[PDB]
Each structure stands twice: as structure tokens, then as C-alpha cells.
Enzyme design. Structure first.
Site, PDB file in Angstrom:
ATOM      1  N   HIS A 354       0.788  -1.230   0.000  1.00 45.69           N
ATOM      2  CA  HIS A 354       0.000   0.000   0.000  1.00 45.69           C
ATOM      3  C   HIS A 354       0.824   1.287   0.000  1.00 45.69           C
ATOM      4  CE1 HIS A 354      -3.992  -1.819   0.632  1.00 45.69           C
ATOM      5  NE2 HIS A 354      -3.337  -2.737   1.322  1.00 45.69           N
ATOM      6  N   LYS A 545      -8.588  14.189   3.177  1.00 40.44           N
ATOM      7  CA  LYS A 545      -7.691  13.033   3.285  1.00 40.44           C
ATOM      8  C   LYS A 545      -6.803  13.295   4.502  1.00 40.44           C
ATOM      9  CE  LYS A 545      -6.378  13.857  -0.890  1.00 40.44           C
ATOM     10  NZ  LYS A 545      -6.202  12.604  -1.702  1.00 40.44           N
ATOM     11  N   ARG A 546      -6.051  12.286   4.933  1.00 38.11           N
ATOM     12  CA  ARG A 546      -5.142  12.471   6.065  1.00 38.11           C
ATOM     13  C   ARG A 546      -4.112  13.574   5.775  1.00 38.11           C
ATOM     14  NH1 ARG A 546      -5.297   8.620  10.466  1.00 38.11           N
ATOM     15  NH2 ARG A 546      -3.609   9.954  11.249  1.00 38.11           N
ATOM     16  N   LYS A 551       0.937  14.456   0.459  1.00 40.79           N
ATOM     17  CA  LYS A 551      -0.365  14.815  -0.093  1.00 40.79           C
ATOM     18  C   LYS A 551      -0.447  16.301  -0.476  1.00 40.79           C
ATOM     19  CE  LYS A 551      -2.524  10.965   2.430  1.00 40.79           C
ATOM     20  NZ  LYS A 551      -3.468  10.349   1.449  1.00 40.79           N
ATOM     21  N   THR A 653      -8.164   6.526  -3.057  1.00 38.99           N
ATOM     22  CA  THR A 653      -9.539   6.059  -3.263  1.00 38.99           C
ATOM     23  C   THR A 653     -10.524   7.215  -3.137  1.00 38.99           C
ATOM     24  OG1 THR A 653      -9.674   5.304  -0.966  1.00 38.99           O
ATOM     25  CG2 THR A 653      -9.158   3.639  -2.631  1.00 38.99           C
ATOM     26  N   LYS A 657     -14.167   8.312  -5.284  1.00 36.24           N
ATOM     27  CA  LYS A 657     -15.412   8.759  -4.659  1.00 36.24           C
ATOM     28  C   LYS A 657     -15.943  10.051  -5.297  1.00 36.24           C
ATOM     29  CE  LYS A 657     -13.533   6.842  -0.339  1.00 36.24           C
ATOM     30  NZ  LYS A 657     -13.144   7.109   1.095  1.00 36.24           N
TER      31      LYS A 657
END
Ligand SMILES: O=C(Nc1ccc2ccccc2c1)C(=O)N[C@@H]1O[C@H](CO)[C@@H](O)[C@H](O)[C@H]1O
Length: 813
Positions: A354, A545-546, A551, A653, A657
Site C-alpha cells: 500500500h 484526506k489524512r 499529499k 480512493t 469517490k
């Protein structure tokens, strides 16, 4: 009310109403005069739960009769969210329950808001496990989810003076109606002790025993009457545990030590902390699960057929101890010879990776394993020796390959590389998006790929269209169903048929209408629950998101400040108004991630109260981002931010969505973004920035952030504002760490993508000025989002890894 929510038959409604009243009276011990909304929620939950039971007992009895190959999905995380609505949807009960509650004088949506999220996960990896269980039930697979019943899930995030505060997520406080305790199936787990060698084999002796108590939660398939099981272990002290009055009392109080194993989820997203408690959790779930697996197999002596009857999927390396634990059982307890045991193990296990980030990889110090699991360390050394012999035989004289591929990492502290262990002990290794899977073959596991090319696969991630369309966006699901029927809900490829509606004026109007209603509803939620005011006509620009550096929430921050500075420079010029929403949790000890949150709120403090800005720019930090909040904000979004540095986000993911729910995507060619753009056409995607190859070139040369600072005046201004204390008047140097990081130690090259990002953001604004063309591009996205259904993902796992055939055939009701 709406079609896809099922029938509200006279007889069904009457039955629901009476079982509701029965549960309120007999189960809750309340009458209508003292009952609160929470009591009403529970009576409904119990009423819906009753409908599962028959199907659950008959699904499990069916598996006992037919004896199919069983799939065991092992995970430390299952990020389930709420269960009430999902159960109603999968059982076709939603409209009936809506009617029945209305007739009782209740609002079902108000009752649904009372359910706590089951937050037994951190983010992507945890939510994937949850989507996977849904798809496996929907595809009629004999599958079991196995994990830990954490007393406390991911922490509740509160924002205080712009800072993140963590509080315990006491999700079990009012009870959990979805679980069934199974104390009669309690199993022992061993820790510590020592290894004794006898005439006939090794023996693990003098161990401390912790009990594992299972709790079963039903997992209903979509309208196929299949109900699978998620089994979560809870830790219990044995009754002779630690067994004077002070001594007697203390011995009973020390039972807590054993029961701490299942107390709390580690809140780290993509970072490895070598804590003993975490290692205990990992062994606990593995040891208890494998005994259950073996028990079930023996109730079908000959372990040759074991891999024909069992598949074990490892959700990352967290349950990697399954490999030496299976070896231990087969060799030490069942007395199989090593080579035969090993063949069985390899053919049973498969491993999903992952992340490629080095700090995230599990590398357990040898001295920890030595003390806690002395027998498993021996088995690991033995696995390593036999594995390196094969490498030596295949690549003779390549001594450096030998050290690179070793399960044992030498150095200051010796460590075990758990990823290396998984590859050696699994028949299949997969990444979670095509680009990620290729990266595994070319870089981090290149040596393993050269040895065993056949092990390496791709399985691009997916999301369940049940929770992520039907449940959270009924309005969109309905207008789609009006045109193409209902079959797409379990066959998402059918959305392609919407392509022939892209020039349909009715459909264009309906798509745009559903979005505006989602935006109005969410704007209201923000006022009611958080007293914050937003313009629902503005573009909803969301990144949820985290919080992590890779990110690049910081890149988003730079754009936001740029827009603000441009407005202040030319106040009376027209700009497309935006509401910029950023949400997500930071891991409690990740200082930089906590600083980013504070920055976001600090920008909002300046931007949201500048009179010259007006309602043209709003910056909002979405507090306590979690599954139930995602279900609300995703349908309301116009722009999805997926802006990780190329090569860092394995898949993502959240991206999927948003695509499914009518937002356009601004993002880099990273993870699943690549395949999404490929499915929709690059012209229907806002792609910007370095590709993976460009990042490589920059590293060879060396990344110098100063260069970008010197050549981009707009970027210079922002950095100077941060340094000088523009966004923190009373603590001028508050953001010195952020600036220092950006200027000197930026692993993720925020500045390198800044120009293209701002440029591309202007193209977004331009398109949004043309409502009809925005909506037509939206329709092109929704219509090509079919590949990203977890039903597709799971069918590929079933066929290419597990060797089982998915089925859409109903079990009798
Ligand atoms: O690595 C992830 N999480 C964790 C969770 C706990 C950890 C504990 C210790 C060490 C690493 C950990 C990583 C993770 O969530 N990875 C994400 O997985 C998603 C599903 O495959 C991907 O979509 C996403 O790209 C990836 O970052």
C-alpha cells in the site's frame, strides 16, 4: 419516495412498525413518554438487525454444506463508518423503514445521525478493507474479515485556537447493536516464554497466555441474501491471571495489562513506529485467526488440500506474522516436514502493498522479536537462510544482491524487513494501481521481481458504489436509474450508457440540479452544526484526506494565498468565487502535519474576515474528517484535489469517490489518477505537474527550492508574508518551520509544481464560468467511473489470486 430505495408495501410497513414498538418496550425498557431520539435510533437498529439474522444463519450454514474455498482477509484496520443505512440499502428496506418511521411520527434521517462511526481505521487502507467486505458479500464469495475490536478507534479531532486536539473515540459507550459477542469461541494466544529442543522437535514453553474473544458483525451483500461475517478479536485475561489483600486486589487490577492489547488503534497514517504494544496487536490477531482457520478446515489431517480450501490475504505487512505462525503450527504442532509446510504456506498466502515511502515500511528490531516471540524469530532465520540459498543459486557471486534481499537487516540494531518476509512467503504480491505496481517492479522490489517475476501483479483499487453513490447521493442514483435502470448498482460498467446523454438537455439540467441541491444541503449543515457561513453559488474546492506532506495540502495553501493576493491587488476585477474546504486528521506526534492544520486555519482567519474579499473567497477547515463526513461533503463537491507529488500516492480512493459523485479532478499523474484520466479522456481531467520521470530527473540534478523562489515573484511574496508574520500577527515567527522546510528540506518538491498548478487552477475557473460545459465534462467523468468499482477489483483478486469464481446468484430469502 425515490425508486432505488425499494418498495414500501402495506404489509412490510405494518410489520416494521410493530417490531419497532416491541423493541422499544422489551429491548430498551422504555415507553413513548420517556424515549429520546437515541432510544428511537436503537429500536430501529434492532428492528433492521432482525432481518439480517435469518440470512446470516443460512449463509453460514450454506458454506458448511457446500464447503467452498474460504477467503480470509486479514487486516489491522476496518474503517466501517455507520451501519444502519447501509444495511437498509442492501436489504431493500430503506423506503419501508422511512414510511414506517414517518407513520410513527419520526424522521429517519435524524435517527441515522445518532449512530457512531465504527472508526477502526486511519484512512485509505482501512476504508479499502471495508469496501472489499461489501464487494465480497455482493459477489457471493465465502469471505471473512478478521481484525481487532478496538475499544477506541481513530481519535475525534477538535480544533482549538486553530490547533488539533485529540480526544478518545468512545464509540462503544452506548453499545453496539450490530455485533454479537461469541465468548464460547474464545481462544488462547501466547507471548514471551522460551524455546526448548526435544528428541522430537522444538517446543515453545513458559509462555504468558492472553485470551482472544471474538465479536461477529454481519456483512450483507447487495440484495442477494448473502450475509458474510466480520470477526473482530477482543483481549481478555485468563482467570488465574497474576493468581495478601493488597496483593489479591493488585492481581485483579493487573488484568488490565493483558486487556490493553485491544484497547486502542494506533493513529499513524503511513509511518512506522516500532512499539511493543503494536507488535502484540499484530501477533494477537494473527494467532487467534489462524487457529479459527485451521479449526474450520479440520471440520471439513491432510494439509495438502489446505491451499485448495484456504486463501489468506494480507492487508499490508501488518499481519505478516501469519507466515511464520502458519509454519510454526504446521511444523511444531502438526508435525509436517519443513518443505511441505512451506509449500502449503506459500500457496495459501498473498500480500498487498500500500506504500513505497521508506518511513512507512515495517522493520522490527530483532531484540523485540527475540523476547516476545522467540520461536517465530527462529522460523524467520530459517526462512531467510533457505531463501538466500535460492538467490545465491540463481545469481552466483552477486554478494550485494544477497544483502539487499535478506529478511534480516544488519546495522546498529538488527531488524526484520516484514515486506521481504511477505514476498518470500506469498504466491502473489500486488500493488494497488498500475503505476504503483510498476514502481514496485522497477525500484523497491526489483531484486525480488528478477528472482520471481510470476509473483508480481496489479490490482487497481476500487470503492463500493453502494455506500459511495446510492447511500450518500440518492438524488444522483435516481436520475441515473430513470434513464438506464437499476442494474448498474451491482454492475457499474453500465454507467457508460450515460455517454449517449451528454448532449441531452434534460439530463444536463438534472445533473446540475442534483449537485446544487447537494451543495445547499451541505451549506446548511455547516451553519447548523458549526455556525459558519458559505456562498452555495461558489465553486466547492475540496481536499479531504489524512494530513501528510506527500499529499501536499501545502501546495493547496499556496494557491489559496495567491488568489487572495491577486484579489487584494485588483479588488474590482471579477473572479469565480470559491469555497476552499480542507479536512483531515494529523497523527498525534507528527509536528509538521499539525503545523499545516494551524496554517490552514490561520489563512482562513485572514481571508474570511477581509471586507474587500467579500464572499468571493472562503477558506474552511473541515473538523473531524471521517467516513460519515465524507458521505456528506463528497456529493457536494465541484473540484476534487488530488495533488500528491508524482510517485508517492500508491493509488488513492478518495479520488474515485469524487469522480463517481460529479466533481471534476485537479491532480497529478499519480496513483489511480492516471487510470481515471485514461478512462475519461485526458481532455476531461485537469492534469498538471511533474510526471514520475520528471521527479527522477530533478533528484539526479538536486532539488533547489531557492531557484523557484528567485524566479517567481508571486511565490516570493507568499513566503515573505509567512516569514514576516502576516498570517500570525502576535506570533510573527510561528511558521518558521514551514518556511525552513519549504526552502531547504522539501522531500516533495512543493515549489516545483506551483506554477503549473496555479495555471491549471485558472483553467478550472474558466470552465466553471460555463455551467453547461462544466456539467457535460462532469457527465463524461461519471459515465467512465465504472472501472473503479470494488466489485471489479474483487473479481480480479478472486480470479487471478484466490482461484475462486464470483457469483451474482441469489440465495433463497
Ligand atoms: O499505508 C497506509 N496506512 C498505514 C496505516 C498504518 C500504518 C502503521 C505502521 C506503518 C505504516 C502504516 C500505514 C495507507 O493507508 N496507504 C494507502 O492505502 C490506500 C488503499 O490501498 C491507497 O489508496 C493509498 O494510496 C495509500 O496511501
Amino acid at each position: 419516495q425515490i425508486s432505488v430505495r425499494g418498495l414500501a408495501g402495506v404489509e412490510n410497513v405494518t410489520e416494521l412498525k410493530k417490531n419497532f414498538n416491541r423493541h422499544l418496550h422489551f429491548t430498551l425498557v422504555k415507553d413513548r413518554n420517556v424515549a429520546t431520539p437515541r432510544d428511537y435510533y436503537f429500536a430501529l437498529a434492532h428492528t433492521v438487525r432482525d432481518h439480517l439474522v435469518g440470512r446470516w444463519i443460512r449463509t453460514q450454514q450454506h458454506y458448511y454444506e457446500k464447503d467452498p474455498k474460504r477467503i480470509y482477509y486479514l487486516s489491522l484496520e476496518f474503517y466501517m463508518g455507520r451501519t444502519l443505512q447501509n444495511t437498509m440499502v442492501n436489504l431493500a428496506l430503506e423506503n419501508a423503514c422511512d414510511e414506517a418511521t414517518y407513520q410513527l411520527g419520526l424522521d429517519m434521517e435524524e435517527l441515522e445521525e445518532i449512530e457512531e462511526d465504527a472508526g477502526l481505521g486511519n484512512g485509505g487502507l482501512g476504508r479499502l478493507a471495508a469496501c472489499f467486505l461489501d464487494s465480497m458479500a455482493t459477489l457471493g464469495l465465502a469471505a471473512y474479515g478478521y481484525g481487532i475490536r478496538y475499544e477506541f478507534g481513530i481519535f475525534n479531532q477538535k480544533i482549538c485556537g486553530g490547533w488539533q486536539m485529540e480526544e478518545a473515540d468512545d464509540w462503544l459507550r452506548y453499545g453496539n447493536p450490530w455485533e454479537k459477542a461469541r465468548p464460547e469461541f474464545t481462544l488462547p494466544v501466547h507471548f514471551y516464554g522460551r524455546v526448548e529442543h526435544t528428541s522430537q522437535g522444538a517446543k515453545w514453553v513458559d509462555t504468558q497466555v492472553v485470551l482472544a474473544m471474538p465479536y461477529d458483525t454481519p456483512v450483507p451483500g447487495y440484495r442477494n441474501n448473502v450475509v458474510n461475517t466480520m470477526r473482530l478479536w477482543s483481549a481478555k485475561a485468563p482467570n488465574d491471571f497474576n493468581l495478601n489483600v493488597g496483593g489479591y486486589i493488585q492481581a485483579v487490577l493487573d488484568r488490565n495489562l493483558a486487556e490493553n492489547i485491544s484497547r486502542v488503534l494506533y493513529p499513524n497514517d503511513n509511518f512506522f513506529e516500532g512499539k511493543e504494544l503494536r507488535l502484540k496487536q499484530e501477533y494477537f490477531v494473527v494467532a487467534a485467526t489462524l487457529q479459527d482457520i485451521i479449526r474450520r478446515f479440520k471440520s471439513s489431517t491432510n494439509f495438502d488440500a489446505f491451499p485448495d480450501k484456504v486463501a489468506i490475504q494480507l492487508n499490508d505487512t501488518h499481519p505478516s506474522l501469519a507466515i511464520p505462525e502458519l509454519m510454526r503450527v504446521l511444523v511444531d504442532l502438526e508435525r509436517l516436514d519443513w518443505d511441505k509446510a512451506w509449500e502449503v504456506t506459500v500457496k495459501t498466502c498473498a500480500y498487498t502493498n500500500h506504500t513505497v515511502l521508506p518511513e512507512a515500511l515495517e522493520r522490527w528490531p530483532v531484540h523485540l522479536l527475540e523476547t516476545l516471540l522467540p520461536r517465530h524469530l527462529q522460523i524467520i532465520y530459517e526462512i531467510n537462510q533457505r531463501f538466500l540459498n535460492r538467490v545465491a543459486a540463481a545469481f552466483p557471486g552477486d554478494v550485494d544482491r544477497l544483502r539487499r534481499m535478506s529478511l534480516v537487516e544488519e546495522g546498529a540494531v538488527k531488524r526484520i524487513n516484514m515486506a521481504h518476509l511477505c514476498i518470500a512467503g506469498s504466491h502473489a504480491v500486488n500493488g494497488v494501481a498500475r503505476i504503483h505496481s510498476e514502481i514496485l517492479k522497477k525500484t523497491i522490489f526489483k531484486d525480488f521481481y528478477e528472482l520471481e517475476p510470476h509473483k508480481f501483479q496489479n490490482k487497481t483499487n476500487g470503492i463500493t458504489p453502494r455506500r459511495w453513490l446510492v447511500l450518500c447521493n440518492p438524488g444522483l442514483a435516481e436520475i441515473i436509474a430513470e434513464r438506464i435502470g437499476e442494474e448498474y448498482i451491482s454492475d457499474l460498467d453500465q454507467l457508460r450508457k450515460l455517454l449517449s446523454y451528454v448532449d441531452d438537455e434534460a439530463f444536463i439540467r438534472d445533473v446540475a440540479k442534483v449537485k446544487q441541491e447537494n451543495k445547499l444541503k451541505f451549506a446548511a449543515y455547516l451553519e447548523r452544526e458549526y455556525k459558519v457561513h458559505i456562498n452555495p453559488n461558489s465553486l466547492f474546492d475540496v481536499q479531504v484526506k489524512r494530513i501528510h506532506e506527500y499529499k501536499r495540502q501545502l501546495l493547496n495553501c499556496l494557491h489559496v494565498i495567491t488568489l487572495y493576493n491577486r484579489i487584494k491587488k485588483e479588488p474590482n476585477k471579477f473572479v469565480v468565487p470559491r469555497t476552499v474546504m480542507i479536512g483531515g486528521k494529523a497523527a498525534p506526534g507528527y509536528h509538521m502535519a499539525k503545523m499545516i492544520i494551524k496554517l490552514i486555519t490561520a489563512i482562513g482567519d485572514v481571508v474570511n474576515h477581509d471586507p474587500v474579499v467579500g464572499d468571493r473567497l472562503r477558506v474552511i477547515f473541515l473538523e473531524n474528517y471521517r467516513v460519515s463526513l465524507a458521505e456528506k461533503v463528497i456529493p457536494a463537491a465541484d473540484l476534487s484535489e488530488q495533488i500528491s507529488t508524482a510517485g508517492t500516492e500508491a493509488s488513492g480512493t478518495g479520488n474515485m469517490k469524487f469522480m463517481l459523485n460529479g466533481a471534476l479532478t485537479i491532480g497529478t499523474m499519480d496513483g489511480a489518477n492516471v487510470e481515471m484520466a485514461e478512462e475519461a479522456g485526458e481532455e476531461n481531467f485537469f492534469i498538471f505537474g511533474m510526471r514520475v520521470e520528471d521527479v527522477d530527473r530533478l533528484d539526479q540534478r538536486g532539488y533547489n527550492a531557492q531557484e523557484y523562489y528567485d524566479r517567481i515573484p508571486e511565490l516570493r511574496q507568499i513566503i515573505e508574508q509567512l516569514s514576516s508574520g502576516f498570517f500570525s500577527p502576535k506570533q510573527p515567527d510561528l511558521f518558521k518551520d514551514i518556511v525552513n522546510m519549504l526552502m531547504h528540506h522539501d522531500r516533495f518538491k512543493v515549489f516545483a509544481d506551483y506554477e503549473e498548478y496555479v495555471k491549471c487552477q485558472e483553467r478550472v475557473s474558466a470552465l466553471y464560468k460555463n455551467p453547461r460545459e462544466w456539467t457535460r465534462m462532469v457527465i463524461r467523468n461519471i459515465a467512465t467511473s465504472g472501472k473503479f468499482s470494488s466489485d471489479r477489483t474483487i473479481a480480479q483478486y478472486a480470479r487471478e489470486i484466490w482461484g475462486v469464481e464470483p457469483s451474482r446468484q441469489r440465495l433463497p430469502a
